[PDB]
Write a protein that holds these residues in place. Structure first.
Motif, PDB file in Angstrom:
ATOM      1  N   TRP A 132       0.508  58.432  20.444  1.00 33.22           N
ATOM      2  CA  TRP A 132      -0.865  58.894  20.609  1.00 33.22           C
ATOM      3  C   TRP A 132      -1.826  57.726  20.774  1.00 33.22           C
ATOM      4  N   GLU A 133      -1.514  56.578  20.167  1.00 31.74           N
ATOM      5  CA  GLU A 133      -2.397  55.425  20.296  1.00 31.74           C
ATOM      6  C   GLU A 133      -2.359  54.868  21.711  1.00 31.74           C
ATOM      7  N   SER A 134      -1.183  54.885  22.347  1.00 34.46           N
ATOM      8  CA  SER A 134      -1.091  54.441  23.732  1.00 34.46           C
ATOM      9  C   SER A 134      -1.827  55.393  24.667  1.00 34.46           C
ATOM     10  N   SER A 139      -4.612  57.422  23.755  1.00 35.30           N
ATOM     11  CA  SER A 139      -6.049  57.570  23.546  1.00 35.30           C
ATOM     12  C   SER A 139      -6.820  56.259  23.661  1.00 35.30           C
ATOM     13  N   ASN A 140      -6.213  55.123  23.317  1.00 32.47           N
ATOM     14  CA  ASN A 140      -6.920  53.837  23.305  1.00 32.47           C
ATOM     15  C   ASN A 140      -6.901  53.246  24.712  1.00 32.47           C
ATOM     16  N   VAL A 141      -8.024  53.357  25.423  1.00 32.49           N
ATOM     17  CA  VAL A 141      -8.083  52.927  26.816  1.00 32.49           C
ATOM     18  C   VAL A 141      -8.370  51.433  26.936  1.00 32.49           C
ATOM     19  N   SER A 142      -8.414  50.718  25.808  1.00 27.17           N
ATOM     20  CA  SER A 142      -8.584  49.267  25.870  1.00 27.17           C
ATOM     21  C   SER A 142      -7.311  48.579  26.346  1.00 27.17           C
ATOM     22  N   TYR A 143      -6.157  49.185  26.086  1.00 25.89           N
ATOM     23  CA  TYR A 143      -4.890  48.688  26.595  1.00 25.89           C
ATOM     24  C   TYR A 143      -4.783  48.879  28.106  1.00 25.89           C
ATOM     25  N   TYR A 144      -4.023  47.992  28.745  1.00 31.55           N
ATOM     26  CA  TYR A 144      -3.357  48.388  29.970  1.00 31.55           C
ATOM     27  C   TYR A 144      -2.104  49.173  29.605  1.00 31.55           C
ATOM     28  N   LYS A 178     -11.324  38.038  24.977  1.00 23.19           N
ATOM     29  CA  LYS A 178     -11.373  38.154  23.523  1.00 23.19           C
ATOM     30  C   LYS A 178     -10.113  38.820  22.983  1.00 23.19           C
ATOM     31  N   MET A 179      -9.751  39.974  23.543  1.00 16.38           N
ATOM     32  CA  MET A 179      -8.636  40.741  23.009  1.00 16.38           C
ATOM     33  C   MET A 179      -7.290  40.201  23.481  1.00 16.38           C
ATOM     34  N   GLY A 180      -7.245  39.577  24.653  1.00 11.18           N
ATOM     35  CA  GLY A 180      -6.046  38.923  25.112  1.00 11.18           C
ATOM     36  C   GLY A 180      -5.414  39.624  26.293  1.00 11.18           C
ATOM     37  N   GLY A 211      -2.962  42.105  28.358  1.00  7.62           N
ATOM     38  CA  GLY A 211      -2.638  43.487  28.100  1.00  7.62           C
ATOM     39  C   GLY A 211      -3.814  44.343  27.693  1.00  7.62           C
ATOM     40  N   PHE A 212      -5.024  43.780  27.657  1.00  7.15           N
ATOM     41  CA  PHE A 212      -6.232  44.501  27.277  1.00  7.15           C
ATOM     42  C   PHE A 212      -7.275  44.352  28.375  1.00  7.15           C
ATOM     43  N   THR A 213      -8.063  45.409  28.580  1.00  3.28           N
ATOM     44  CA  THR A 213      -9.028  45.444  29.669  1.00  3.28           C
ATOM     45  C   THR A 213     -10.413  45.837  29.171  1.00  3.28           C
ATOM     46  N   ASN A 221     -10.857  56.975  13.910  1.00  2.81           N
ATOM     47  CA  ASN A 221     -10.819  55.645  14.502  1.00  2.81           C
ATOM     48  C   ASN A 221      -9.686  54.850  13.862  1.00  2.81           C
ATOM     49  N   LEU A 222      -9.380  53.705  14.477  1.00  2.89           N
ATOM     50  CA  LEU A 222      -8.152  52.985  14.144  1.00  2.89           C
ATOM     51  C   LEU A 222      -8.252  52.261  12.804  1.00  2.89           C
ATOM     52  N   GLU A 223      -9.444  51.793  12.442  1.00  4.31           N
ATOM     53  CA  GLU A 223      -9.594  51.044  11.201  1.00  4.31           C
ATOM     54  C   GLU A 223      -9.351  51.948   9.994  1.00  4.31           C
ATOM     55  N   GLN A 265      -7.490  54.547  10.131  1.00  9.11           N
ATOM     56  CA  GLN A 265      -6.063  54.817  10.204  1.00  9.11           C
ATOM     57  C   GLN A 265      -5.263  53.739   9.491  1.00  9.11           C
ATOM     58  N   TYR A 266      -5.617  52.462   9.691  1.00 10.26           N
ATOM     59  CA  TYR A 266      -4.877  51.430   8.976  1.00 10.26           C
ATOM     60  C   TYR A 266      -5.219  51.440   7.495  1.00 10.26           C
ATOM     61  N   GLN A 267      -6.413  51.919   7.136  1.00  9.82           N
ATOM     62  CA  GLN A 267      -6.712  52.047   5.717  1.00  9.82           C
ATOM     63  C   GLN A 267      -5.876  53.130   5.055  1.00  9.82           C
ATOM     64  N   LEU A 268      -5.407  54.117   5.818  1.00  4.84           N
ATOM     65  CA  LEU A 268      -4.640  55.209   5.232  1.00  4.84           C
ATOM     66  C   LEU A 268      -3.129  55.004   5.292  1.00  4.84           C
ATOM     67  N   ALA A 287      -7.099  53.463  -1.152  1.00  7.69           N
ATOM     68  CA  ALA A 287      -7.335  53.581   0.290  1.00  7.69           C
ATOM     69  C   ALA A 287      -8.839  53.574   0.525  1.00  7.69           C
ATOM     70  N   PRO A 288      -9.440  52.405   0.567  1.00  9.60           N
ATOM     71  CA  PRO A 288     -10.905  52.319   0.581  1.00  9.60           C
ATOM     72  C   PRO A 288     -11.533  52.654   1.924  1.00  9.60           C
ATOM     73  N   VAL A 289     -11.781  53.936   2.189  1.00  9.74           N
ATOM     74  CA  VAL A 289     -12.457  54.337   3.415  1.00  9.74           C
ATOM     75  C   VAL A 289     -13.489  55.414   3.094  1.00  9.74           C
TER      76      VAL A 289
HETATM   77  C1  LIG Z   1      -7.291  49.629  20.631  1.00  4.29           C
HETATM   78  O1  LIG Z   1      -6.245  48.874  20.038  1.00  4.29           O
HETATM   79  C2  LIG Z   1      -6.606  47.541  19.656  1.00  4.29           C
HETATM   80  C3  LIG Z   1      -5.330  46.881  19.170  1.00  4.29           C
HETATM   81  O2  LIG Z   1      -4.616  47.701  18.254  1.00  4.29           O
HETATM   82  C4  LIG Z   1      -7.715  47.592  18.606  1.00  4.29           C
HETATM   83  O3  LIG Z   1      -8.187  46.277  18.332  1.00  4.29           O
HETATM   84  C5  LIG Z   1      -7.716  45.761  17.070  1.00  4.29           C
HETATM   85  O4  LIG Z   1      -8.040  46.509  15.936  1.00  4.29           O
HETATM   86  C6  LIG Z   1      -7.375  46.069  14.738  1.00  4.29           C
HETATM   87  C7  LIG Z   1      -7.911  46.938  13.621  1.00  4.29           C
HETATM   88  O5  LIG Z   1      -9.272  47.279  13.842  1.00  4.29           O
HETATM   89  C8  LIG Z   1      -7.577  44.566  14.468  1.00  4.29           C
HETATM   90  O6  LIG Z   1      -6.568  44.138  13.558  1.00  4.29           O
HETATM   91  C9  LIG Z   1      -7.039  43.705  12.261  1.00  4.29           C
HETATM   92  O7  LIG Z   1      -6.003  42.941  11.587  1.00  4.29           O
HETATM   93  C10 LIG Z   1      -6.356  42.036  10.480  1.00  4.29           C
HETATM   94  C11 LIG Z   1      -5.438  42.340   9.309  1.00  4.29           C
HETATM   95  O8  LIG Z   1      -5.488  43.744   9.077  1.00  4.29           O
HETATM   96  C12 LIG Z   1      -5.527  44.051   7.668  1.00  4.29           C
HETATM   97  O9  LIG Z   1      -5.397  45.461   7.440  1.00  4.29           O
HETATM   98  C13 LIG Z   1      -5.454  45.922   6.059  1.00  4.29           C
HETATM   99  C14 LIG Z   1      -6.915  45.993   5.649  1.00  4.29           C
HETATM  100  O10 LIG Z   1      -7.052  45.553   4.293  1.00  4.29           O
HETATM  101  C15 LIG Z   1      -8.469  45.386   4.075  1.00  4.29           C
HETATM  102  O11 LIG Z   1      -9.032  46.293   3.132  1.00  4.29           O
HETATM  103  C16 LIG Z   1     -10.440  46.074   2.795  1.00  4.29           C
HETATM  104  C17 LIG Z   1     -11.117  47.428   2.750  1.00  4.29           C
HETATM  105  O12 LIG Z   1     -12.525  47.223   2.849  1.00  4.29           O
HETATM  106  C18 LIG Z   1     -11.085  45.107   3.822  1.00  4.29           C
HETATM  107  O13 LIG Z   1     -12.482  44.970   3.566  1.00  4.29           O
HETATM  108  C19 LIG Z   1     -10.363  43.730   3.748  1.00  4.29           C
HETATM  109  O14 LIG Z   1     -10.835  42.847   4.763  1.00  4.29           O
HETATM  110  C20 LIG Z   1      -8.837  43.900   3.812  1.00  4.29           C
HETATM  111  O15 LIG Z   1      -8.409  43.057   4.889  1.00  4.29           O
HETATM  112  C21 LIG Z   1      -4.608  45.019   5.141  1.00  4.29           C
HETATM  113  O16 LIG Z   1      -3.849  45.847   4.276  1.00  4.29           O
HETATM  114  C22 LIG Z   1      -3.674  44.084   5.973  1.00  4.29           C
HETATM  115  O17 LIG Z   1      -2.847  43.297   5.119  1.00  4.29           O
HETATM  116  C23 LIG Z   1      -4.474  43.198   6.917  1.00  4.29           C
HETATM  117  O18 LIG Z   1      -5.077  42.179   6.094  1.00  4.29           O
HETATM  118  C24 LIG Z   1      -7.833  42.185  10.126  1.00  4.29           C
HETATM  119  O19 LIG Z   1      -8.170  41.281   9.090  1.00  4.29           O
HETATM  120  C25 LIG Z   1      -8.616  41.884  11.402  1.00  4.29           C
HETATM  121  O20 LIG Z   1      -9.982  41.576  11.120  1.00  4.29           O
HETATM  122  C26 LIG Z   1      -8.487  43.069  12.331  1.00  4.29           C
HETATM  123  O21 LIG Z   1      -9.490  44.000  11.884  1.00  4.29           O
HETATM  124  C27 LIG Z   1      -7.450  43.707  15.724  1.00  4.29           C
HETATM  125  O22 LIG Z   1      -7.963  42.404  15.468  1.00  4.29           O
HETATM  126  C28 LIG Z   1      -8.196  44.346  16.886  1.00  4.29           C
HETATM  127  N1  LIG Z   1      -8.059  43.559  18.105  1.00  4.29           N
HETATM  128  C29 LIG Z   1      -6.899  43.319  18.728  1.00  4.29           C
HETATM  129  C30 LIG Z   1      -6.990  42.490  19.978  1.00  4.29           C
HETATM  130  O23 LIG Z   1      -5.820  43.745  18.304  1.00  4.29           O
HETATM  131  C31 LIG Z   1      -8.895  48.396  19.135  1.00  4.29           C
HETATM  132  O24 LIG Z   1      -9.850  48.552  18.091  1.00  4.29           O
HETATM  133  C32 LIG Z   1      -8.452  49.770  19.641  1.00  4.29           C
HETATM  134  N2  LIG Z   1      -9.571  50.472  20.247  1.00  4.29           N
HETATM  135  C33 LIG Z   1     -10.009  51.657  19.805  1.00  4.29           C
HETATM  136  C34 LIG Z   1     -11.176  52.248  20.549  1.00  4.29           C
HETATM  137  O25 LIG Z   1      -9.483  52.232  18.845  1.00  4.29           O
END
Ligand SMILES: *[C@@H]1O[C@H](CO)[C@@H](O[C@@H]2O[C@H](CO)[C@@H](O[C@H]3O[C@H](CO[C@H]4O[C@H](CO[C@H]5O[C@H](CO)[C@@H](O)[C@H](O)[C@@H]5O)[C@@H](O)[C@H](O)[C@@H]4O)[C@@H](O)[C@H](O)[C@@H]3O)[C@H](O)[C@H]2NC(C)=O)[C@H](O)[C@H]1NC(C)=O
Ligand SMILES: *[C@@H]1O[C@H](CO)[C@@H](O[C@@H]2O[C@H](CO)[C@@H](O[C@H]3O[C@H](CO[C@H]4O[C@H](CO[C@H]5O[C@H](CO)[C@@H](O)[C@H](O)[C@@H]5O)[C@@H](O)[C@H](O)[C@@H]4O)[C@@H](O)[C@H](O)[C@@H]3O)[C@H](O)[C@H]2NC(C)=O)[C@H](O)[C@H]1NC(C)=O
Ligand code: HEM
Ligand code: HEM
Ligand SMILES: *[C@@H]1O[C@H](CO)[C@@H](O[C@@H]2O[C@H](CO)[C@@H](O)[C@H](O)[C@H]2NC(C)=O)[C@H](O)[C@H]1NC(C)=O
Ligand SMILES: *[C@@H]1O[C@H](CO)[C@@H](O[C@@H]2O[C@H](CO)[C@@H](O)[C@H](O)[C@H]2NC(C)=O)[C@H](O)[C@H]1NC(C)=O
Ligand SMILES: *[C@@H]1O[C@H](CO)[C@@H](O[C@@H]2O[C@H](CO)[C@@H](O)[C@H](O)[C@H]2NC(C)=O)[C@H](O)[C@H]1NC(C)=O
Ligand SMILES: *[C@@H]1O[C@H](CO)[C@@H](O[C@@H]2O[C@H](CO)[C@@H](O)[C@H](O)[C@H]2NC(C)=O)[C@H](O)[C@H]1NC(C)=O
Ligand SMILES: COc1ccc(-c2noc(CC(=O)O)c2-c2ccc(OC)cc2)cc1
Ligand SMILES: COc1ccc(-c2noc(CC(=O)O)c2-c2ccc(OC)cc2)cc1
Ligand SMILES: CCCCCCCCO[C@@H]1O[C@H](CO)[C@@H](O)[C@H](O)[C@H]1O
Ligand SMILES: CCCCCCCCO[C@@H]1O[C@H](CO)[C@@H](O)[C@H](O)[C@H]1O
Ligand SMILES: CCCCCCCCO[C@@H]1O[C@H](CO)[C@@H](O)[C@H](O)[C@H]1O
Lengths: 553, 553
Positions: free
Chosen positions: A108-110, A112-117, A184-186, A188-190, B206-208, B210-213, B238-240
């Motif tokens: 589902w992530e592939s 819905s997320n249109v940031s990927y190619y 920024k994203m690297g 495979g991303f658009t 949203n994805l953030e 999702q990773y929190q859960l 699960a802090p969201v």
């Molecule tokens: C399309 O997909 C792309 C790629 O998947 C999305 O862009 C990426 O989004 C990612 C998530 O937003 C991002 O990755 C993150 O990775 C590191 C490490 O992640 C941590 O995750 C949990 C979080 O734990 C946190 O909990 C507290 C709660 O409040 C936080 O404050 C605290 O900071 C703590 O870390 C941890 O369990 C785990 O161990 C990791 O530490 C993060 O630190 C990064 O900042 C980043 O958010 C990634 O960088 C994004 N970019 C890329 C190029 O991958 C894109 O968002 C998506 N588009 C849409 C529309 O959904």
């Protein structure tokens, strides 16, 4: 143990799925075959396989027999074959899209997320012996050495098919609305989230930039007057992010939808032409709709420019690129009977495949003057100095380079071809033969069958060690061309499915949108149905120069 | 001058387009009709119009004749009529979507910006005399007075069709993955960007989040153990962002995909059930795929829960809602021959239409105990106290209220029905008869033809002044019901097209996704094909209670 999916066992779009610790299964669903490898053909697939002529033979029929195609073009057989080209080629592209750089499976992530190619084939798995799977050397050839030895231009090889630089800058302008790789994203991303012909290279890839570019009067775009001629406005008047030389004189920067169009004069040429076209269409709509506000005059004119973009790219751009005596046709109604998903998602392989830098010449001849790359790249006054009439006239006379055949990239831009090879290794693209099998072709058995040539093929056999380890982009560019054509077999059978799926997967081609009310009445709808590039240029100029996708005789 | 589109001249999906200062034209393209108003029928459309039985007669055939449908369900006719149900109803929904709150015309911004809701009919134009067009009073009735006089429950009217509160909390849980109206952006805007059955009410919008859960081990979701039973985890783990009473004891908050599921115990009941199902599917996938990482075990289990969600909602949810002796079937292969766009975009009218608050009872009977709204709303310990077995057992025995007929909304939640009327005026929805004409029905000629009733209809004739000024939501709820059914004609013919287009427009129903490799082999693909709600509950519990969408005999 060795990952069995590294052997690429699944044939004919079969899906390799690992079971247990060491085993695998192929998913032959709707592949047309059955069996463990998806190689046991069904009855209809066997019949259509034995009755299938080779792509080179089809190219022979479409590029010869002028007496026959003069009859075909005058009858309904033109519409029948056009429907056949569209359905057969776009059936080969997965819609909804399948994979991306993150997921080598359906998710589902592939979706819905249109940031990927997206990508057609999965990546080479991380636990493979060879970087290309199982066949080849333990490390791959140097990208700089492959580019210097096999892709670098020594003598200029012109396109035998007659292609302009007007074509080539149209191809750079057109394709950078869906090719915006995120730094920024690297890889495979658009950033181009429209994933198609949205004209985000004119109106911006996000809404805030779009409002920065709009005049908010009569639906027009902002503009500036230089020497009595309409040009895109200054960044002082349209304050949005534009890549330019650090230390230029802004108040001479120009603001357009694509951030990098300032760096080349031909790209800003087309941006000027389309901006003039947008405001001309706004005048025509306001004449017929006095009651419309700014938004409707704007958005319907955008839909008119989207439609006439697809009209021009099918009936002139791809027409010039094909060399067909069959006259191609843009009619969305041809697909109204079939099951066709009106969606597009840009593939990373299709990004690899439009690196047409061999089109660029040794120098840029403008009339009596001849400008070098250092005189042409990054130049900011040449557009306003000569005018759009003169640069269209000069670009429509200078020949462009042949794409295929190898050894035709100028050294100024050869570094691009280097990085796209290295990026191909970052994205873990599968070998070139696996993309031949995915797009309905037999894999090559030797390098000399690839090149039709003795020297380069043997040196490639020393570099790669096996034909099944050849990479995607070098395989597309070093392939033998069809006789007297712009490029070769794999660029045909891989490039046409992405390109036509991208042209008619636009929702304006859907039955819900493809009607006259969408375009503000019959006026704009005939603007879509009647658009040539001669009308795109000469209706927005004072004089009508030579404008074409091919050189004059 | 008067805007002619205020008169709604264009019939049968025709498009009113203003020309000049005062005139208009209808676009009859592919409407099946021609003429100025799009009222002159074509030959096939006339034949199919005269041979078209009324929706009440079709409801009669589908709800009677048990001997006939026992034969139909055992043969291929079951598959034929199901295809007919799918194709005919979803054809009535525009795909690609057409309009939104901003644009009463087709635009690229309405296509690409998924932050909007879409809409089937345009808004009432701003320059109309009447707020509903041309017919009616200069101002509309008070929403609080309409709700108090016509929608407020006096005596509890149970659903004659047997509907549970297990059904009703399933309908609230299910529909809040694509109904998330943005308080920041306002009405007409949504936070649920999947626009369908993405299970973003489980995995986050949203994805953030999702990773929190996610546990990031074996593809599972995070969870906590209370009394030996699996529950969603604490917000400290699960802090969201989770909406809760200001001043609760977190370390007793629960974190789930939807921000508001903490506010009702039945919503957190279903979130608990689906979380247990997610981790059970993760165990089943890891048994078969020892090599898979966390992402593939996660995303494929999400696709399994998406698929079995659609299986349950077609073959049990809509089955219970229809009362059909025809046994409905979820088979995406039924649509592989037709032209069907595998996309969905949530309409604002469909948001108006799923306000099923009449389902909620006067009180919430749990075994011997009987809880009031103040005891049930916002309650945080009832789920862990009784357990999911006991709350499923209690909700599957208490009757739910009849939706249609009017005068069946409890006063605790009647304010919701007030705001949705007021929101209907903010969004400028067209009159109820215009949506009847849009969804293939004849408009009502009087209020007593609407209600089948004497008192309410005459008081409505005093309030509105004309049947052609009746609003959308009051028209859906005050309509006469079909005999012994949950609601009436317009809720059928409007609700089924959105709902089925939303169920099979999911890309997992496409030919590209609907195969076993998408679900990790035959195990998960048979988990989709075999899912009941009894299996959704009793495989994730210690005891198997009474679980159903209908009360026991
Ligand atoms: C399309 O997909 C792309 C790629 O998947 C999305 O862009 C990426 O989004 C990612 C998530 O937003 C991002 O990755 C993150 O990775 C590191 C490490 O992640 C941590 O995750 C949990 C979080 O734990 C946190 O909990 C507290 C709660 O409040 C936080 O404050 C605290 O900071 C703590 O870390 C941890 O369990 C785990 O161990 C990791 O530490 C993060 O630190 C990064 O900042 C980043 O958010 C990634 O960088 C994004 N970019 C890329 C190029 O991958 C894109 O968002 C998506 N588009 C849409 C529309 O959904
Ligand atoms: C889906 O659609 C929705 C709805 O359209 C999007 O959400 C909205 O986005 C809007 C724009 O991002 C936003 O509206 C804005 O409204 C005004 C805009 O006025 C601007 O311009 C004038 C004049 O130009 C100014 O520009 C320069 C630039 O640098 C300024 O410094 C300078 O001051 C100059 O005057 C000004 O009057 C004004 O200052 C603005 O610059 C703003 O005032 C608003 O704050 C807002 O930005 C709207 O609020 C958004 N929300 C809603 C509910 O409408 C959504 O983005 C879109 N989604 C996607 C994915 O595209
Ligand atoms: C003077 C002419 C040209 C110059 C200076 C130029 C330069 C460049 C550069 C510097 C890059 C970035 C590569 C990287 O960052 O690794 C690039 C990418 C690219 N080039 Fe060109 N190029 C030219 C002509 C063309 C033409 C005619 C086409 C026709 C299709 C083309 C197609 C592309 C594409 C599709 C990309 C990828 C864009 C992306 O990923 O966002 N180029 N080019
Ligand atoms: C105790 C039970 C319920 C309570 C307390 C409740 C309360 C509410 C409230 C306060 C709103 C917000 C209205 C506004 O902000 O103007 C709302 C919206 C809504 N309700 Fe419920 N409701 C209940 C039951 C149901 C049920 C069973 C359904 C079944 C479909 C339902 C469907 C909806 C929908 C679709 C919305 C719109 C959501 C959105 O726009 O984001 N409600 N409800
Ligand atoms: C499907 O493809 C695989 C890999 O190409 C085949 O497996 C090979 O079979 C040969 C002959 O039995 C063995 O010597 C190799 O060791 C096998 N390799 C692997 C990786 O398993 C398999 O035989 C094919 N299926 C059929 C029915 O021929
Ligand atoms: C950018 O293009 C302009 C063309 O207008 C160049 O200026 C011309 O240069 C040629 C030869 O170099 C002269 O014959 C013309 O008379 C010049 N015209 C003007 C108006 O200056 C300019 O040199 C180019 N930029 C760079 C960096 O070379
Ligand atoms: C199409 O619909 C419009 C509006 O319902 C019709 O126009 C009305 O016609 C009556 C009859 O003469 C006039 O009294 C009204 O003043 C008209 N209203 C408007 C807004 O024009 C129109 O006649 C219909 N088309 C046809 C062919 O009957
Ligand atoms: C939330 O629900 C719990 C039930 O789990 C309520 O506590 C019960 O209240 C009833 C009477 O109202 C007693 O007979 C039970 O013995 C109580 N059980 C427990 C475990 O406390 C609680 O009152 C509800 N919350 C509110 C605010 O009413
Ligand atoms: C790589 O970028 C592209 C862009 C467009 C096409 C393309 N689309 O449709 C057709 C007609 C067809 O399908 O045959 C062709 C084509 C075919 C033959 C041909 O010979 C040189 C040149 C182009 C292919 C690749
Ligand atoms: C308002 O929310 C919904 C949700 C689902 C449906 C729906 N979808 O398919 C069918 C079967 C069909 O198409 O007839 C029905 C249906 C039909 C008759 C019926 O009578 C009470 C009840 C439901 C309709 C409205
Ligand atoms: C005789 C003229 C026939 C014109 C129809 C040509 C269109 C069919 O094109 C075919 O598409 C397939 C899939 O991409 C390829 O595998 C075939 O080699 C190619 O010929
Ligand atoms: C029905 C009429 C058939 C006429 C036969 C046309 C012969 C075309 O012959 C083609 O020549 C190409 C090289 O020029 C080869 O690459 C192709 O494989 C070959 O089929
Ligand atoms: C506005 C254009 C109307 C054309 C199609 C008629 C819309 C309603 O089509 C519906 O199809 C259903 C499928 O079983 C039937 O059950 C309903 O009785 C019928 O109303």
């Amino acid at each position: 143990p060795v990952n069995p999916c590294c052997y690429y066992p699944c044939q004919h779009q079969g899906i390799c799925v690992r079971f247990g610790l060491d085993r695998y299964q192929c998913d032959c669903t709707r592949t047309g075959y059955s069996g463990p490898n998806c190689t046991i053909p069904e009855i209809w697939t066997w019949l259509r396989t034995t009755l299938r002529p080779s792509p080179s033979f089809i190219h022979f029929l479409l590029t010869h027999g002028r007496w026959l195609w003069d009859f075909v073009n005058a009858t309904f057989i033109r519409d029948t074959l056009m429907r056949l080209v569209l359905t057969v080629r776009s059936n080969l592209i997965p819609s909804p899209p399948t994979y991306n750089i993150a997921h080598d499976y359906i998710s589902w992530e592939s979706f819905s997320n249109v940031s990927y190619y997206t990508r057609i084939l999965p990546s080479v798995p991380r636990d493979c012996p060879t970087p290309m799977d199982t066949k080849g050397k333990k490390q791959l050839p140097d990208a700089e050495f492959l580019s210097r030895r096999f892709l670098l231009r020594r003598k200029f090889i012109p396109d035998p098919q007659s292609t302009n630089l007007m074509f080539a800058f149209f191809a750079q302008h057109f394709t950078h609305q869906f090719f915006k790789t995120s730094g920024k994203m690297g890889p495979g991303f658009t950033k181009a989230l429209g994933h198609g012909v949205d004209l985000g290279h004119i109106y911006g890839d996000n809404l805030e930039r779009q409002y920065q570019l709009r005049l908010f009067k009569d639906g027009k775009l902002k503009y500036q007057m230089l020497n009595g001629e309409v040009y895109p406005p200054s960044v002082e008047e349209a304050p949005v992010l534009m890549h330019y030389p650090r230390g230029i004189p802004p108040q001479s920067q120009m603001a357009v939808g694509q951030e990098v169009f300032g760096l080349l004069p031909g790209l800003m040429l087309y941006a000027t032409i389309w901006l003039r076209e947008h405001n001309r269409v706004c005048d025509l709509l306001k004449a017929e709709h006095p009651t419309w506000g700014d938004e409707q005059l704007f958005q319907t004119a955008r839909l008119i420019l989207i439609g006439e973009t697809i009209k021009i790219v099918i009936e002139e751009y791809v027409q010039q690129l094909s060399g067909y005596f069959l006259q191609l046709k843009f009619d969305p109604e041809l697909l109204f009977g079939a099951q066709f998903q009106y969606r597009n998602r840009i593939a990373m392989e299709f990004n690899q495949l439009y690196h047409w830098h061999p089109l660029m010449p040794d120098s840029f001849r403008v009339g009596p003057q001849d400008y070098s790359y250092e005189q042409f790249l990054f130049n900011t006054s040449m557009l306003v100095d000569y005018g759009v009439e003169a640069l269209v006239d000069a670009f429509s006379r200078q020949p462009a380079g042949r794409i295929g055949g190898g050894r035709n990239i100028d050294h100024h831009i050869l570094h691009v071809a280097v990085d796209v090879i290295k990026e191909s290794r970052v994205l873990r693209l599968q070998p070139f033969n696996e993309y031949r099998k995915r797009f309905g072709m037999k894999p090559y058995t030797s390098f000399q069958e690839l090149t039709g040539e003795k020297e380069m093929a043997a040196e490639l056999e020393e570099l790669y060690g096996d034909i099944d380890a050849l990479e995607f982009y070098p395989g597309l560019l070093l392939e033998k061309c069809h006789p007297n054509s712009i490029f070769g077999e794999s660029m045909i059978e891989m490039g046409a499915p992405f390109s036509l799926k991208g042209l008619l997967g636009n929702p304006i081609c859907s039955p819900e949108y493809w009607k006259a009310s969408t375009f503000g009445g019959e006026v704009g709808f005939n603007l879509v149905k009647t658009a040539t590039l001669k009308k795109l240029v000469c209706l927005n100029t004072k004089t009508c120069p030579y404008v074409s996708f091919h050189v004059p005789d």
